[PDB]
Amino acid sequence: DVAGLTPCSESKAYNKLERKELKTLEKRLKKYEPGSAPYLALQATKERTQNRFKNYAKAGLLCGNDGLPHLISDPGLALRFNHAGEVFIPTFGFLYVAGYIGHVGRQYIIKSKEDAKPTDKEIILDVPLALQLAFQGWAWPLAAIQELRNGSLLEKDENITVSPR
């Protein structure tokens, strides 16, 4: 009940929107015979809509004055009202995946530079090496913070290409 908003199950506009969607799906369904493929397609669409509306309810989602669910982004407030699974857990998961991408790209950049014509390896990818680095990135934060600890993650300002002042 934060931000002056009501839960989706307790709200009336949420149920009104669900009823309107079911009504227009039934209006589209009534134009087809029950023994036709569009009838089964529309029945599956209605079942998916009902399942989605049931899953959005009883999951902590809340909507304000329009029946459209709202998401709470501040940690702590989302922790004490069971809204962490809205954005807090997905943002951590996306950070994990983005760090996976960055670590894999960094490993491929570093590991394909101690050879003749590194641009050729950049343009024609070493597929077994790329797959090996792909399956070795599951521990990206450990290796990242260890490279930070030993100083190989960052380059010194003496070996870095720099623009004139």
Partner 1 sequence: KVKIAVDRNPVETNFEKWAKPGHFSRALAKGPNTTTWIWNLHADAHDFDNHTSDLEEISRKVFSAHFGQLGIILIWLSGMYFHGARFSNYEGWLSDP
Partner 2 sequence: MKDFTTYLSTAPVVGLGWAIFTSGLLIEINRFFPDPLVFSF
Partner 3 sequence: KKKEVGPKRGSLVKVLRPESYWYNQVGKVVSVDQSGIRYPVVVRFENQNYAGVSTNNYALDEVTDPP
Ligand X SMILES: CC1=C(/C=C/C(C)=C/C=C/C(C)=C\C=C\C=C(C)\C=C\C=C(C)\C=C\C2=C(C)CCCC2(C)C)C(C)(C)CCC1
Task: List the single partner that 109 binds among ligand CLA, partner 1, ligand X, none, CB under 5 to 8 Å by kind.
Answer: ligand CLA
d(CA 96, CA 56): 26
Among 60, 64, 67, 99, binds ligand CLA (CB under 6 A): 99
For residue 63, list its beta bridge partners.
Answer: 6, 69
The contacts of residue 4 (CB under 8 Å, 6+ apart) are 64
Out of 1, 33, 114, 158, name the contact with partner 3 by CB under 8 A.
158
Q: How many residues bind ligand X (CB under 6 A)?
A: 12
Judged by CB under 6 A, does residue 120 bind ligand CLA?
A: no
Instruction: List the structure tokens of 123.
Output: 């343009």
Q: Does 117 bind partner 1 (CB under 8 A)?
A: yes
The answer to whether residue 77 forms part of the interface with ligand CLA (CB under 6 A) is yes
Distance in angstroms (rounded) separating the CA atoms of residues 2 and 142: 37
The amino acid at 37:
A
Q: How far is the CB of 25 from ligand CLA (least distance, A)?
A: 16
Q: In whole angstroms, what is the distance from residue 61 CA to residue 71 CA?
A: 7
Task: Give me the torsion for CA of 125, 129, 131, 135, rounded to 10°.
Answer: -140
Q: Which residues of the shown chain bind partner 1 in the complex (CB under 8 A)? A: 117, 119-120, 122-124
Contact residues for ligand X (CB under 6 A)?
73-75, 87-88, 91, 99, 102-103, 106, 144, 153
